[PDB]
Subunit: 43 residues, 4 copies
């Protein structure tokens, strides 16, 4: 159970890394959406 | 195992916070998209 | 440890529900993005 | 606790699959956004 639970902890931290990466990319989308909207308002 | 239980709980609280922030950013994104869509119809 | 691990399982299933909900909303964004792109190609 | 360990592992595998799918949909989304952005510049 000790080793099995140690694997669980490692796998959780791995999935947190995936979520952090996803978060950064989703923020990049907000920057693009804002830029697109501004271009339409300008036109 | 009580120590590793504490590690698991800690990681899960971190995950919850990150998922919660993904959800609030999703809201921001879709409402931008809907504005953009409105303007392409209006134009 | 039994009750503590039972709480962990419940909290995991709860976070899976959040992720499922987020997934559905993210798909809705793809539909909007596709529609926006088509409107530009049309114009 | 061995039974509850199996429940935890099962939920974590499900989560991984769902996060993985969120990441591939993110790719689809941003490349649509970039196309849209290109066209507003080109137009
Ligand atoms: Ca998105």
């Amino acid at each position: 159970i000790e080793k099995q639970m140690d694997r669980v902890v490692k796998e959780m931290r791995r999935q947190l890394e995936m979520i952090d990466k996803l978060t950064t990319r989703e923020i990049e989308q907000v920057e693009l959406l804002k830029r697109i909207y501004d271009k339409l308002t300008v036109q």
